[PDB]
């Protein structure tokens, strides 16, 4: 099953990363930042440019050659929208354990076809597209998030918004809690990882003692997350979950920047998601600026 790849979400210092779109503008820049951060970036791919070096690392024509020649266990994709779905498909075909797609603008129908193959295998775990990536603070950064705001700690963060991930990270660092693992699942309507996938990892992770879930209008992933929490985050040793849901004031029928952020047909509203999460024991911060303080209070009240 595809849920067997959920464990690949938890990057660490031993994660080895290749970059698809390595020689491109954003692939080059963030590859530099990954190397300066300490990420084990070992190479990358650009069709037709194999046999070259880039930032002192080998460039390969295919994901498979890159994987075999470096032992990479993760790939990050900076490939433009017309080709990024094929770049994801190649990484699935190469059985890369973790694939992170940053690209925004992939046709929805392309990702429907990607998910059809993705859901019928268990080797490759896909994060994204239209996502900031995943970071283990002080161990491994795969994506675009600013590393200097992070702090190794005990809050797990999953978010459909990249910028709101940075907010939660900055607030939890300021109050001293830090972060265990941050996963930005992106704002597209069809992607490789939802809230429940990350929640399963967070609940079984001893380094994770609290959770911040950031959602927004559109879809029903926040509702599915609430049902998951009702069944698996009760019990005697429950972990505190704080949430914020964007789009309380979004107008209906418009996609609010994200391809997946739209209220249509009386569905996808933020208020129903807040209600669903609260019924699952989630403490929903009304203000996005109070995520750090809200989960801090939950840590204080929990002694």
């Amino acid at each position: 099953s595809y849920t067997a790849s959920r464990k690949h979400l938890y990057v660490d210092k031993n994660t080895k990363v290749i970059c698809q779109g390595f020689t491109g503008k954003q692939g080059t820049f963030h590859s530099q930042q990954a190397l300066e951060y300490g990420t084990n970036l070992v190479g990358g791919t650009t069709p037709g440019k194999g046999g070259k070096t880039h930032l002192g690392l080998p460039v390969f024509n295919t994901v498979k050659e890159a994987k075999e020649q470096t032992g990479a266990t993760a790939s990050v994709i900076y490939v433009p929208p017309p080709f990024a779905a094929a770049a994801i498909n190649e990484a699935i075909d190469a059985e890369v354990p973790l694939v992170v797609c940053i690209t925004e603008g992939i046709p929805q129908q392309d990702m429907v076809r990607v998910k059809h193959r993705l859901l019928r295998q268990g080797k490759t775990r896909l994060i994204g597209p239209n996502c900031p990536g995943v970071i283990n603070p002080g161990e491994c950064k795969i994506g675009i998030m600013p590393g200097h705001i992070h702090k190794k700690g005990r809050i797990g963060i999953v978010s459909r918004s990249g910028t709101l991930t940075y907010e939660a990270v900055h607030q939890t660092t300021q109050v001293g809690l830090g972060q265990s693992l941050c996963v930005g699942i992106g704002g597209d309507p069809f992607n490789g990882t939802d809230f429940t996938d990350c929640l399963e990892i967070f609940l079984n992770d001893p380094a994770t003692e609290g959770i911040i879930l950031i959602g927004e209008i559109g879809g029903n992933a926040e509702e599915n997350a609430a049902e998951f929490l009702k069944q698996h985050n009760s019990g005697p040793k429950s972990k505190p979950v704080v949430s914020f849901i964007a789009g309380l004031t979004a107008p209906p029928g418009r996609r609010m920047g994200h391809a997946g952020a739209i209220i249509a047909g009386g569905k996808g509203g933020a208020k129903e998601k807040i209600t669903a999460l609260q019924s699952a024991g989630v403490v929903v911060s009304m203000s996005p600026a109070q995520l750090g303080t809200t989960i801090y209070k939950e840590f204080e009240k929990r002694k």
Partner: protein, 393 residues
């Protein structure tokens, strides 16, 4: 994007979907000749505007009604003479109406049974879905509210394609009988292929119905397109009709800026979709009304900042501007430079609340400090929202 009735129905017709026969006319004489060529028992003349309420609308010529039925082609031309070049005002338009440049001259069809049929991508089932109801000709979520047993769904496998058993079952659940059921099933298959061919997010037909003469027809439809696929749907996006759009949004479209106008007076300048939605939310929570949503992310360039800022300052509603950036892939100094230069060649005259975090924030704050602009720096989201609300009436 937006398409006129004749554009989407031509798109459907070219792909084997049954719509009423029609021509489009740019002059009155063209409408007369089109009505003659139709060879139709009864003819419907429809002014082409995006907004609704054409039936009860008034033209700036004095002609009442944007939809007229007649059997005489000369009446079609005469009435079109009182339509083309005039403004049509309805319940859904600004009071000065919308200019009618084109009319539709179509065969008027009688309707004896109305159903609802839509095709879209289902986020829960990860594939296309047929959504139908035998209760057509009304609001679909109204039907879902009071009669959810009358909503029928067929989940389709994207690789397998639509199966004849799926098309036939939906046509049966829609209420079509006998040969009309086979006809409806075949139309559902052609609607499905059209849906995939044009990268639609939704093809919605209402009413999907039949004529007394026993033909299954898509009498009216709306097609929503996936903006992510414009690069491979350029011929369709070239047809986009921006004449009834908020003009500031038209200016935003010229520069590929995600702008959505709202009804407030606090302009929003944000680099993330979630943060921008959260910014609108927190302004409201602190007593303010945002004038707009703006998502300016990715590898944003200083020229995009310059244009977006000019756009916000051109809105007469705007009494203050809230800049809120948590940069990751966005370099904060690019924001600071684009704003400072904008305020040079624009003369800033509204309060500017600025909050910057993330990539290269220290260099960016130094650009703002040495600018002499009237800036009120904010500390966090709450402080930014309260300070912006404090800056306006």
């Amino acid at each position: 994007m937006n398409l006129q009735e004749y554009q989407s129905k031509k798109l459907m017709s070219d792909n084997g979907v049954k719509v009423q026969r029609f021509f489009v006319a740019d002059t009155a004489n063209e409408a007369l000749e089109a009505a003659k060529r139709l060879n139709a028992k009864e003819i419907v003349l429809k002014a082409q505007i995006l907004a609704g309420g054409r039936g009860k609308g008034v033209f700036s010529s004095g002609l009442k009604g944007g939809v007229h039925l007649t059997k005489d082609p000369e009446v079609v031309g005469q009435l079109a003479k009182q339509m083309i070049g005039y403004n049509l005002a309805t319940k859904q338009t600004p009071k000065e109406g919308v200019k009618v440049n084109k009319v539709m001259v179509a065969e008027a069809l009688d309707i004896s049974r109305e159903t609802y049929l839509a095709i879209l991508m289902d986020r829960s089932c990860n594939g296309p879905v047929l959504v139908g109801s035998p209760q057509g000709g009304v609001d679909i979520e109204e039907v879902a509210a009071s009669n959810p047993e009358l909503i029928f769904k067929e989940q389709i496998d994207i690789i397998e394609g639509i199966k004849d058993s799926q098309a036939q079952r939906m046509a049966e659940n829609l209420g079509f009988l006998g040969p009309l059921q086979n006809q409806a099933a075949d139309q559902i298959k052609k609607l499905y292929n059209l849906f995939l061919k044009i990268d639609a997010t939704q093809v919605e037909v209402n009413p999907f119905g039949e004529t007394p003469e026993g033909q299954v027809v898509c009498f009216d439809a709306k097609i929503n397109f996936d903006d992510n696929a414009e690069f491979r749907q350029k011929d369709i996006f070239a047809m986009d009709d921006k004449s009834e759009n908020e003009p500031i949004e038209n200016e935003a479209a010229k520069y590929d800026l995600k702008y959505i106008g709202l009804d407030g007076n606090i302009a929003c300048f944000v680099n993330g979709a979630g943060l921008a939605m959260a910014t609108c939310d927190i302004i409201f929570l602190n007593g303010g009304k945002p004038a707009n949503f703006l998502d300016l992310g990715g590898g944003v360039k200083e020229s995009q900042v310059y244009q977006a800022f000019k756009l916000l300052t051109a809105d007469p509603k705007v009494e203050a501007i809230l800049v809120n950036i948590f940069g990751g892939i966005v370099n904060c100094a690019i924001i600071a430079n684009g704003i400072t230069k904008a305020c040079r060649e624009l003369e800033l005259k509204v309060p500017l609340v600025v909050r910057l975090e993330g990539t290269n924030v220290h260099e960016a704050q130094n650009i703002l400090t040495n600018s002499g602009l009237p800036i009120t720096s904010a500390v966090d989201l709450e402080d930014a929202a309260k300070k912006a609300v404090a800056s306006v009436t």
